[PDB]
């Protein structure tokens, strides 16, 4: 199977440069083009450019000619995209894709900010038709993202993890809720597992009936 494995998320300061990678496997790397695509949060797709890894030749969208530099390393079967003079406008998910767009990388999130990383506080939303709703409020973190699971992944039915909101403070908040049988509140432990990778914060909060 063809795979394009992109590097992990980046939190980088404005005015600096960042270099993201796209490691190809499962095919002759030098016989196919690699294209790069930008997607700002909640927006559409934008084409950055393309590289021929065999010849090293490139073509750039004029809008990215100054911003972006595409390179390829034949020995490691890896394509790279460097973005220079970073601003908040560059905060986006960046995808690599093999020519034509059948095979895509999983995307790399780049957040450009001078703000400090901050881990969340996690507060219970306690339960109080036979259905009870409960949840966890994940408050005051930066940057995105936070992921939430319930009962270490054993509880998925009826879960809603809401998109985060940017508060007026400049910090993010989200909530995750689940609906369960009220008859289970006395017999089943409910734990929300909150992961904020940028701050290495893990919280497993038990949500008790009140």
Partner 1 sequence: DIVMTQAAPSVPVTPGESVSISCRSSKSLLHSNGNTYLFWFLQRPGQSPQVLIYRMSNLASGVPDRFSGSGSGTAFTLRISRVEAEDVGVYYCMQHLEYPYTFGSGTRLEIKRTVAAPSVFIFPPSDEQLKSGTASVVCLLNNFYPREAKVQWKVDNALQSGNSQESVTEQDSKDSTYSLSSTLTLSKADYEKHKVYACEVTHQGLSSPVTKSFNRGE
Binding residues for partner 1 (CB under 8 A): 35, 37, 44-47, 49-50, 59-63, 95, 97, 100-102, 104-107, 121, 123-126, 128-129, 131, 133, 135, 137, 139, 160, 162-165, 167, 173-175, 177, 179
In the complex with partner 1, the residue whose CB is nearer, 11 or 48, is 48
Q: Which is nearer to partner 1, 14 or 54 (CB)?
A: 54
How far is CA 87 from each of CA 7, 18, 44, 90, 110, rounded to the nearest angstrom? 20, 11, 19, 6, 11
With CA atoms as reference, report the closest residue to 181 among 113, 118, 132, 147: 132
| Pairwise CA distance, residues 51 & 59, whole Å | 7
Q: Report the residue number, 130 or 186, with the smaller CB distance to partner 1.
A: 130
Residue pair 79/51 in contact (Cβ under 8 Å)? The answer is yes
CB of 14 to partner 1, least distance (A): 26
Min dist CB 208 to partner 1, Å, is 10
């Amino acid at each position: 199977q063809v795979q394009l494995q992109q590097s992990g998320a980046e939190l980088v300061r404005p005015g600096t440069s960042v270099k993201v990678s796209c490691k190809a496997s499962g095919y002759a790397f030098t016989n196919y083009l690699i294209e790069w695509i930008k997607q700002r949060p909640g927006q559409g797709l934008e084409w950055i450019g393309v590289i021929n890894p065999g010849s090293g030749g490139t073509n750039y969208n004029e809008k990215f000619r100054v911003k972006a530099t595409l390179t390829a390393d034949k020995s490691s079967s890896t394509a790279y995209m460097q973005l220079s003079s970073l601003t908040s406008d560059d905060s986006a998910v960046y995808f690599c894709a093999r020519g034509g767009g059948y095979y895509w990388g999983q995307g790399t999130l780049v957040t450009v900010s001078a703000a400090s990383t901050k881990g969340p506080s996690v507060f219970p939303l306690a339960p109080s038709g036979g259905t009870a709703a409960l949840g966890c409020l994940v408050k005051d973190y930066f940057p995105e993202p936070v992921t939430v699971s319930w009962n270490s992944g054993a509880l998925t039915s009826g879960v809603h993890t809401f998109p985060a909101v940017l508060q007026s403070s400049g910090l993010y908040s989200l909530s995750s809720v689940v609906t369960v049988p009220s008859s289970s509140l006395g017999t089943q432990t409910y734990i929300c597992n909150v992961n904020h990778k940028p701050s290495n914060t893990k919280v497993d909060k038990k949500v008790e009936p009140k």
